[PDB]
Design a protein around this ligand. Sequence first.
Ligand SMILES: O=C(O)[C@@H]1O[C@@H](O[C@H]2[C@H](O)[C@@H](NS(=O)(=O)O)[C@@H](O)O[C@@H]2COS(=O)(=O)O)[C@H](OS(=O)(=O)O)[C@@H](O)[C@@H]1O[C@H]1O[C@H](COS(=O)(=O)O)[C@@H](O[C@@H]2O[C@@H](C(=O)O)[C@@H](O[C@H]3O[C@H](COS(=O)(=O)O)[C@@H](O[C@@H]4O[C@@H](C(=O)O)[C@@H](O[C@H]5O[C@H](COS(=O)(=O)O)[C@@H](O[C@@H]6O[C@@H](C(=O)O)[C@@H](O[C@H]7O[C@H](COS(=O)(=O)O)[C@@H](O)[C@H](O)[C@H]7NS(=O)(=O)O)[C@H](O)[C@H]6OS(=O)(=O)O)[C@H](O)[C@H]5NS(=O)(=O)O)[C@H](O)[C@H]4OS(=O)(=O)O)[C@H](O)[C@H]3NS(=O)(=O)O)[C@H](O)[C@H]2OS(=O)(=O)O)[C@H](O)[C@H]1NS(=O)(=O)O
Ligand code: CU
Ligand code: ZN
Lengths: 179, 921, 213, 212
Amino acid sequence: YPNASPLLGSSWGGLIHLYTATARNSYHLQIHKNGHVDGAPHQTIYSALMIRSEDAGFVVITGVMSRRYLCMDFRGNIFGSHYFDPENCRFQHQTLENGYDVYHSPQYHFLVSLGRAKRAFLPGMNPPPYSQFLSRRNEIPLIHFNTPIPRQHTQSAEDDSERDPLNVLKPRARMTPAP
Amino acid sequence: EPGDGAQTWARFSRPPAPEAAGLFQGTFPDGFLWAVGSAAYQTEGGWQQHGKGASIWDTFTHHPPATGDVASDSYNNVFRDTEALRELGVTHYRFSISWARVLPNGSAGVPNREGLRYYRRLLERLRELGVQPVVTLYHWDLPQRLQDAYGGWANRALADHFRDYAELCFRHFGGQVKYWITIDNPYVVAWHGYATGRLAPGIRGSPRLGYLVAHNLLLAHAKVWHLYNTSFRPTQGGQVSIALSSHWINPRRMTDHSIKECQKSLDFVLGWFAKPVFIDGDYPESMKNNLSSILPDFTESEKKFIKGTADFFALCFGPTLSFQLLDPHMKFRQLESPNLRQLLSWIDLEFNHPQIFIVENGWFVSGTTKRDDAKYMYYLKKFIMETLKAIKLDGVDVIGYTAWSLMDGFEWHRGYSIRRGLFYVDFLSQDKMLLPKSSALFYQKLIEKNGFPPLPENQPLEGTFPCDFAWGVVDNYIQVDTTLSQFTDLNVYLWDVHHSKRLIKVDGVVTKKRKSYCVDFAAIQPQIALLQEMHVTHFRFSLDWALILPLGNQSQVNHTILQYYRCMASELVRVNITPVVALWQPMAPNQGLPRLLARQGAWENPYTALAFAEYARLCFQELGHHVKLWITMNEPYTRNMTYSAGHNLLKAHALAWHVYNEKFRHAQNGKISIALQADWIEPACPFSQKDKEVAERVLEFDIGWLAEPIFGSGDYPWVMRDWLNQRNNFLLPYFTEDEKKLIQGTFDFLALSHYTTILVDSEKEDPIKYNDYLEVQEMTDITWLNSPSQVAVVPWGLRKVLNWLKFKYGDLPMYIISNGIDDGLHAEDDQLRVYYMQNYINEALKAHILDGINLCGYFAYSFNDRTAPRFGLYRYAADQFEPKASMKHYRKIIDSNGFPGPETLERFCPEEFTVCTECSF
Amino acid sequence: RMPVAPYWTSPEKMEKKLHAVPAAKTVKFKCPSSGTPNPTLRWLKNGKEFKPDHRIGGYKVRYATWSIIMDSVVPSDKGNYTCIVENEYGSINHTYQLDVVERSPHRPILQAGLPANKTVALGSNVEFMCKVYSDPQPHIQWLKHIEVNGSKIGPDNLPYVQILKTAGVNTTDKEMEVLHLRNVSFEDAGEYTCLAGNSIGLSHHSAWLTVLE
Amino acid sequence: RMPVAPYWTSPEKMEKKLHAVPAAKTVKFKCPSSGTPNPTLRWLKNGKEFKPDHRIGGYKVRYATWSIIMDSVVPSDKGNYTCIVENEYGSINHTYQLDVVERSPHRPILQAGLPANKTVALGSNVEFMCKVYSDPQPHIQWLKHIEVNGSKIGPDNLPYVQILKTAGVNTTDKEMEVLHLRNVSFEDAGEYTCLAGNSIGLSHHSAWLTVL
Ligand SMILES: O=C(O)[C@@H]1O[C@@H](O[C@H]2[C@H](O)[C@@H](NS(=O)(=O)O)[C@@H](O)O[C@@H]2COS(=O)(=O)O)[C@H](OS(=O)(=O)O)[C@@H](O)[C@@H]1O[C@H]1O[C@H](COS(=O)(=O)O)[C@@H](O[C@@H]2O[C@@H](C(=O)O)[C@@H](O[C@H]3O[C@H](COS(=O)(=O)O)[C@@H](O[C@@H]4O[C@@H](C(=O)O)[C@@H](O[C@H]5O[C@H](COS(=O)(=O)O)[C@@H](O[C@@H]6O[C@@H](C(=O)O)[C@@H](O[C@H]7O[C@H](COS(=O)(=O)O)[C@@H](O)[C@H](O)[C@H]7NS(=O)(=O)O)[C@H](O)[C@H]6OS(=O)(=O)O)[C@H](O)[C@H]5NS(=O)(=O)O)[C@H](O)[C@H]4OS(=O)(=O)O)[C@H](O)[C@H]3NS(=O)(=O)O)[C@H](O)[C@H]2OS(=O)(=O)O)[C@H](O)[C@H]1NS(=O)(=O)O
Ligand SMILES: [Cu+2]
Ligand SMILES: [Zn+2]
């Protein structure tokens, strides 16, 4: 009757999307195969993240379709990277008193943001826009992730003087000798 | 109404169901018209006999040389044509009255009574046999007098002459004939007669002349149909139509601009005449918004004249227009398809559900082709299956099918280089006998069966596989990740419990390393959990020889990879899943070998055979306590290896088998054999003896090459040796007596890998696709369901190859060691995998129960999609494994132990009775 | 006077498609309109018409800024909220989506009784188990209390441990739930600690393994 | 025009100083004045000038009604918010004590395994623990499943409570965790629950009890 949902813990190991918002527009942190992170207004398959903490309170954000790792340069601009560089690509997580997550780098001090004015996490003092996150759990089915799915438009004998359009003749590749 | 057919490419973009419309069978309606067709210039011959006037095909082919003067000589041979009609069992014969034969000088003049009595004798023979005639008045053989005197169909004064001539025909033959076609293919008459010059008069005027000629063709057809409707349909009660040929067209990419360009293509080609005749009397507005000065205008009296002026839709869908004479400007940068089912749905939608008489249909073969036409037969099978799908699955009102060209003849711009006949005609002969082709026997048996009834060899069987049947899955690329998950950190730490639970390292203090178990390997237990979800009894995987011995020899045995393999095996035995292990597989970077062994000839080297024997001895020493079922070679590519490579691969198999049999069988009590790939090879024509000989040759070159030394007589098969001797190919090596007794018995079971069947044909259809080595045209039935990678699911070939292996090598234990298909998209290809696995396991059940082979296992191909992508029974996405629907259906097959039926208490096995396992010895 | 159909005064303020807030927050949905006459405002939660008795606490529906103000947002408030503003010359609508995400800023709560004390035979198989309930992403460690150097206790009063298992950026969340001990010796006997921790704090549950025979 | 101190414009709307406000609400402190001429408004966080990045979330100043608005108020927002309005003739001060009372942004978290499935050995001193995590102290009800209606839920979620031990502010919150239970033989052996609930939701944990 009550308690209709899944506990309050066991669900930290699944794919989430890092929602963030300021009061004109709302995004999800999206890691592309380009390595360029941006905001998608809906749960995209490039915004599905797998957050794994390597220390107690220090999370690592990857992004499962991009196969990247959310890292941050020396000036705050986050990006994706295929290789885990454990000194800049690992973020200390905190929860604020309003219930939002913030993720700051331990050395560069800059908050993970989707806005321009990338500032540093001073505790209790107004984080920059698109930097207070919220872990929305995944609603995309798994089949929408593996989508190269190329229907091979081969078009055998592209000229329209074809003797075999329906492809009856179907030769197998062999090895012929040379005595 | 024009525009109702633009929903066709949306109607067929959704994928059909494999279990519903993949072995779609059924019979045609009763009263379906099974017809065979002919023209006049194509078949009759006698171009001047009995005073026949000159046609415009006796001027195009006499120097406008492969002329149609004596084409099939059917003007004199009425009897053998009608005998071919009788032995074909056909219901209707479409033939064509020629204009110049019965009216040489004109309607202003007396008719030629000898040509008229030829058509009368043909019709009375058709009445003796009980076949009904379908008669084309005009099948492109316009007389030369009208072309000379008026300019042909460029003049509107021939519509009177075509009204007079047809009146003659309606007076003479209308009491017998109840189906008339005025003009066959007015597209190509108008467009390659007077706008391209490729056809009958060869004018090469302009497209303006082509549209004016089509204008006059529509007017002449309307005049003839109104003559029939006024003065002949009361007394005779026949039907008059016009035979419109259409292509079918498909979008370059599925945007609505491409779809309206496809509808514009079909309006320019087929709607050109089918919108006047069937809809409103006037051209499509797609052509009236395009060339309204070139396209002539209809008077509205001529819009009520040419409206409703056909009693049925007469469709021609063959090689005349489709892919040959279709104007590429009328394709509108789209892709033409030979899809008759989508075209028939387009006729049903666009022209207000007509009764479609497919009045010419087929494909062709080459002119060098005798009575063995498998390509024509499978195009005819696909086309008749597409009309049956249009009748059944689409509600299209197809009332008849006409297989085109009863006999071989002229082919109008392709001379005699092309054969569309059902009956083979030797054009150099004098008797010109009609010898039945493969397509004639197919079409006769299809008219007799009235379509595709359900065969008794394709209906599912109820029954169970025996106890200790090996229900397995394979993974040829196991994930070898030797990263230990626990007990790797050996430093000693200080745990400040209270003010902390930070961990401070006591520097310098390192404890002892624990003995490594295989709960330490983190990559092992997810795979085994997915295997326990599958309910499989056996799991098959291969070892990487280049990882055990990365230097070829025993000097640098990587015991970490070997411990990973041993603990994969032992943690499979722990959960009651028997591991089957392949020593070598070619599915690898360099032939499955170490890089030192791969760089030294690599199977031509006999040291590779000795090194495989030593590597197999190491594998039986290490992993052999847990693996009790070994595969020596895992499906070698017999189509891509040299005869010396296969010779030393057989020697390597025999050396590893003798190592196991002498040194390791009594200690471990396991079995070892080779896995060979056994795809079935079926003759393309089921009653051709030459195709049976070719099928046995491809079977002995494919399967029997490596199976006959091991499972047979110890030598290479005599079909193989005899085929290579007669072609001066002495590259197949000979076994010495010691080698022959070494390899002759090196098996404990037969492990076969079966995926598809291939049809084979002895005839050289085209030499580019032809295999000159084995003298075989490999081909496929295109009514078979296919995968996205175009491999045919055809389940009875599993039963057929199991029966062939029992016939060739005896009643051995047989493991179907791999069987599966691939996927391409969201979820519709796993409906194909469910259909595949259901019907192939049912045909294995048929081969076990009905045919009595000793089948001991079925192994589904590809455990997951991470390792073998798109083949797997587990979808691998976002770094998770999700079970596909084929996983659940295969698990239901495993748990039921087959297909048990309505009553099931079927165990009956304590202390197992069947003998294909390790018994009391 | 003029029969002005209603329009959005500012569609710049209306392009936030999804409002995902923590629970017990306040959410204002605004859809500012104009027109002659003043077109009345209506809200529909999940298609059905949203009235202030469908929700505990209700809402302010103040029309001077055309906004609904739901105070103390509960997870039984998720779904679509459609602003339909209507008058006799026309009507328009705009659908917001409200997700509610419950937030537990606590230490990782371990399941009670896991891991449990185990006495076992020699050379058997022992699986210690801990379930960790953390709303942030936790780090789980499996430690064994080492007593190798002297006694159990280090230089200060902090016990010696050895990290048997640790969670990384390649470790699945199910992998750390269980520590497996195959063929247990007498040296594999003592205190085994599942220590979980996030940014809020660290918790731990200890168990004891003793070997019979 | 006239050198007079700027006066307040609220007779009985500027006398609520102690603001007992729940967490994640919106506070609005207004100090409405009418300067002679246009005065100087400033807001202070108990001594320092309150610049908008001193609050997680910021704050909105409304010069039209001289009101500071702090939405989604946090527990750290307690203090003395000071409104000072100056002009050239003196200045006027006012204080506002904001005391944010806090509440959990979740249901009551019940620790799993509390309570657990028992094997009650024929009338023991059985005890049923339930650890509850909530910042407002929740309502606790147990719902001993009794053998009415047959099924566990029939016509919409039967009220199976008969327990006098309820939640209470006066009594101590530590030992309402455990369920002191007596007379445990085969007359009551079924499904137990631990309903703890607050302003956000209700949470239940189920355990079985079996007397041999
Ligand atoms: O720069 C920048 O910034 C940027 O830029 C850019 O950028 C990016 C880019 O792109 C780049 N470049 S490139 O080229 O390269 O690309 C670079 O640059 O980078 C960048 C980045 O950025 S950053 O950020 O990083 O920097 C961009 O641009 S673009 O354009 O492009 O876009 C961007 O980004 C930017 O920008 C933009 O945007 C922004 C935003 O965005 S986001 O997204 O981010 O978001 C913006 O901005 C912002 O904003 C602005 C504005 O808006 O203005 C500003 O602001 C602020 O402030 C203001 C004000 O001011 S003052 O000074 O004047 O004061 C504000 O305003 C306001 O608004 C509104 C609000 O409020 O909000 C309004 O109000 C209204 O409503 C209300 C409602 O409420 S509720 O409730 O509903 O909620 C109301 O009220 C109410 O009511 C009342 C009555 O009724 O009365 C009351 O009540 C009660 O009581 C009474 C009594 O009393 S007494 O006193 O009288 O006694 C009674 O009567 C009654 O009845 C009662 N009631 S009951 O209930 O009881 O029954 C109540 O209470 C109330 O309530 S409460 O709550 O309040 O309490 C009211 O009233 C109304 N009013 S009226 O009058 O109107 O009606 C209004 O409208 C107003 O107000 S006023 O007064 O003024 O009028 C606002 O809001 C604010 N905002 S915030 O922010 O804060 O939020 C600002 O500053 C800004 O910020 S920032 O940060 O941004 O800066 C814009 O848009 C733009 N900008 S620009 O310039 O740039 O362009
Ligand atoms: Cu809390
Ligand atoms: Zn053939």
